[PDB]
Symmetry: C4
Subunit: 94 residues, 4 copies
């Protein structure tokens, strides 16, 4: 379960890096904005302060969402249970 969290962590970083490069290049976003936008998209927050304006970007975003949402939320879940859960019990133990 310690290995679980480490595999999900790597795959999320790779997914986020892919988005940062694509949106920086094709949509012209500053890299920090491209990373921020990729995160806001794949967690489904979707503020819309940034959104793709090219047809290439729209098509990429469709696939990016379908491929990436399941991995990011897996990671959030494992981060929730296998890392954030115990530490709270640890601060409780009398």
């Amino acid at each position: 379960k310690d290995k679980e969290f480490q595999v999900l962590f790597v795959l999320t970083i790779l997914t986020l890096i892919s988005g940062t490069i694509f949106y920086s290049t094709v949509e012209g976003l500053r890299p920090i904005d491209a990373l921020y936008f990729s995160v806001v998209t794949l967690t489904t927050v979707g503020y819309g302060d940034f959104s793709p304006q090219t047809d290439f970007g729209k098509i990429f975003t469709i696939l990016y969402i379908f491929i990436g949402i399941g991995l990011v939320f897996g990671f959030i879940h494992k981060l929730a249970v296998n890392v954030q859960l115990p530490s709270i019990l640890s601060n409780l133990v009398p």
Copy 2:
């Protein structure tokens, strides 16, 4: 489980096609924009760069969301477990 993924795949395409035709026609979106908007709606990202402006479109969107979200996320889940999960183990096997 191989058949699971294929049924969910077909139903998602049909749902997305329905949205593309409706929003292209009633809301006047280019078909690519209508497909992109349908995806962004049913994954709950909801950037809001497009949104329905007619009352017909608003009513359709209410039903579209309730009917379609469960199918799309089912598919994302099965895509997550029955397709994207193994391949990662497959790249790990020593």
Copy 3:
């Protein structure tokens, strides 16, 4: 399980009616817009074409979200499994 879907259905309608009255009155939205906005909020789509502008509306929305999201998605889930799932098998049976 037939009764499950009927209880969730009633509670969702009541939740949506509550939102429609509140946002129509305090935020001044047309009733159709208030219902549409309530749905878009509680499914977490959140286009932002409408959003609360008064402090009362912002506070109500915080509570509305926390109280209402769990019920709406329960209903979507049961609609997914106890109504939309079988009919697809029913169209498949050879």
Copy 4:
């Protein structure tokens, strides 16, 4: 299970307080707006009527989302099952 709901409740308040202070200070939002924005972010509604404009705010939001979404939805879930579920059965009992 009564204790479950009380631990999740405290942690959600702490998470929301952290966001309110940060966005009030660094992004200049009125405290009520900062709390409202923190809630809309961590439930993934994401209207985008407010969104971070500084690079510090964008970076904080990335971490805030990853850390906070799992806790908020845990709480919503337990609020759904261990508090909102029974009371409805209680109003049904013949």
